[PDB]
């Protein structure tokens, strides 16, 4: 119980290890397991877990004919066992909510859920088993906010929120909590024309985040936290590894500073790790459609302007759907330098498989290794 | 030896809905996006969608998502595509292509089909 | 759309000669455009594709070149069953757009 502060470096990632699986639809085919979707994984001192937004139901019970809607009374933010199936007997409801985020400080745990009709949106942080301070709707047009996990430095967690439009701008606002209380919060500041989902780790005393350009962007916007000046800045990806799904192919030359046009209105939230030329950057392997998943090599790609990959790792093949990726890390493992971990939704249902009346998925998650391990499919 | 076999027509009756074939030869189906263009009597050619038929994935032009619905009987590697109500304005000619990509829609439509002739009347 | 264009559908050419055809893209496609030939009756076939590279059965003597936003195809010993209309077309980001397409007459 003391503040955790960023005191480490990121270790040279050269392959990846597996850390989870939860095979849940194939348990829940024969199990109470929940119906869920975006899901993320986080740890506490002494525990990590994996979390997601259930649609209130099991799978093969009858009120999951209709859980491709992803906003209603009956969604409950979950946590469950590392590598468990969201189980009726198993899986703590943290709060209400259709949109979320939560991570530990060092002392207590923080989870913000937003809930709301889609003009009438409302955050409520809770800190530590008990609501601590309300939030409302500044722009009345969906108020939504990251689904992964936050950063804390030193009693500060900084997060991010958008309320607004999709299409088109939107007002995005960074906050600052310390133990649930707000202690200040700034527009987007930057060139990073619209963010939303944003992906954030914390690693020498800053947070860093990719998020998503869902307007114009198929690069990805990135914000870069100070937390103890309580600071921001906006800017793009500098690479031709175009990220974004949809995107448009891979351009031989790309923009640093404004949003890679083609393909515009639409996007999926995903992750990186930009710590210079140890950068990977992880997109989904199909043009078009959330279908497998890779991991690429591409030194200093936040400012090199036509930087293509020196080394892969494939994850998910183009044959098996993916959905969301995101990032997180166990900032208390023993250690001089954090081990980068990250997650990969698997998708299963509508729209894609039209022939289930149903829509929820599985997770996988992997961590960072020395050695150059071989590769498998998940 | 990438045969796409097409009839050369179908004649129909307006508003009805006919059902394109477009038989893939000497190659691996399960392993290629198979591509759906149209090419009306006096304009350039219009793509209206993809069928990836190892996976099952399908895309669709703005316009053309109301019309066209695309399917594939892999048994007998046979691209498919529902048109329903048919009129004047789309009597043209249909073609199935594949991309030289095995699943990138990348690489370009390497290996064309004959062309399928649709004529509404009454 | 991303609009494809080929200025005017015809070209001359005394049968012997080198021939250049023109495409134009609506922005910068970075490098991925293809060229197509449609014979006098139906069959289209695939020449050309990333801009410079030719596909499996192709006369010596089609070249290709562009960057960014024009693209050209030059014939060189036009040896007439090649009369006919050439199209180009992108592939950078879907929707897929093609030309217009550019017929052949000669005259000899």
């Known amino acids: 119980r003391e503040f955790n502060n960023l005191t480490k470096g990121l270790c040279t990632i050269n392959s990846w290890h597996i850390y989870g699986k939860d095979n849940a639809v194939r348990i829940g085919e024969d199990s109470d397991v929940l119906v869920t979707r975006e899901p993320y994984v986080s740890c506490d001192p002494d525990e990590c877990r994996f979390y997601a937004l259930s649609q209130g139901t099991t799978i093969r019970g009858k009120h999951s004919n209709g859980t491709i809607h992803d906003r209603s009374q009956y969604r409950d933010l979950i946590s469950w066992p590392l590598s468990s199936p969201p189980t009726v007997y198993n899986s703590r409801v943290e709060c209400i909510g259709w949109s979320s985020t939560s991570c530990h400080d060092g002392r207590a745990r923080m989870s913000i859920c937003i809930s709301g009709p889609n003009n009438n949106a409302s955050a409520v942080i809770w800190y530590n088993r008990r609501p601590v301070t309300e939030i409302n709707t500044w722009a009345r047009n969906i108020l939504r906010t990251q689904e992964s996990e936050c950063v804390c430095q030193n009693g500060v967690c900084p997060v991010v929120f958008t309320d607004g439009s999709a299409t088109g701008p939107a007002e995005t606002r960074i906050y600052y909590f310390k133990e649930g209380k707000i202690l200040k919060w700034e527009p987007l500041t930057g060139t990073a024309k619209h963010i939303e989902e944003c992906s954030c780790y914390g690693e020498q005393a800053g947070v860093t985040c990719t998020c998503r350009d869902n307007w114009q962007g198929s690069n990805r916007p990135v914000i870069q936290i100070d937390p103890v000046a309580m600071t921001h800045t906006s800017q793009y990806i500098c690479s031709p590894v175009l990220t974004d799904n949809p995107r448009p192919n891979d351009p031989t030359v790309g923009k640093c500073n404004d949003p890679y046009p083609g393909n515009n209105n639409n996007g999926v939230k995903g992750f990186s790790y930009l710590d210079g030329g140890n950068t990977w950057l992880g997109r989904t392997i199909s043009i078009a459609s959330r279908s497998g998943y890779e991991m690429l090599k591409v030194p200093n790609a936040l400012t090199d302007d036509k930087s293509r990959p020196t080394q892969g790792q494939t994850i998910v093949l183009n044959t098996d759907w993916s959905g969301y990726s995101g990032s997180f890390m166990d900032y208390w493992a023993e250690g001089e330098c954090y081990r980068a971990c990250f997650y990969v939704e698997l998708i299963r249902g509508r729209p894609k498989e039209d022939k289930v009346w149903w829509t929820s998925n599985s997770i996988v998650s992997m961590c960072s290794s020395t050695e150059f391990l071989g590769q498998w499919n998940w | 030896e990438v045969q796409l076999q097409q009839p050369g027509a179908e004649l129909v009756k307006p508003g009805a809905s006919v059902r394109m074939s477009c038989k893939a030869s000497?190659?691996?189906?399960?392993?290629?996006?198979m591509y759906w263009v149209k090419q009306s009597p006096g304009q350039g050619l219009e793509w209206i969608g993809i069928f990836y038929p190892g996976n099952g994935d399908t895309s669709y032009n703005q316009k053309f998502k109301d019309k066209a619905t695309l399917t594939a009987d892999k048994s007998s590697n046979t691209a498919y595509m529902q048109l329903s109500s048919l009129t004047s304005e789309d009597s043209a000619v249909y073609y199935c292509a594949r991309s030289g990509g095995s699943y990138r829609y990348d690489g370009g439509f390497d290996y064309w089909g004959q062309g399928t002739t649709l004529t509404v009347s009454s | 759309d991303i609009q494809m264009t080929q200025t005017t559908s015809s070209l001359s050419a005394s049968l012997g000669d080198r021939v250049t055809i023109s495409c134009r893209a609506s922005?910068?496609?970075?490098?991925?455009l293809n060229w197509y030939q449609q014979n006098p009756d139906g069959t289209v076939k695939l020449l050309i594709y990333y801009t410079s590279n030719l596909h499996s059965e192709v006369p010596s003597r089609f070249s290709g070149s562009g960057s960014g936003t024009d693209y050209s195809l030059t014939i060189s010993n036009l040896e007439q069953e090649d009369i006919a209309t050439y199209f180009c077309?992108?592939?950078?980001?879907?929707?897929?757009?093609f030309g217009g397409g550019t017929k052949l007459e000669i005259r000899r």
């Open positions: 077309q992108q592939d950078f980001t879907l929707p897929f757009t």
């Open positions: 922005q910068d496609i970075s490098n991925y």
């Open positions: 000497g190659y691996t189906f399960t392993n290629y996006n």
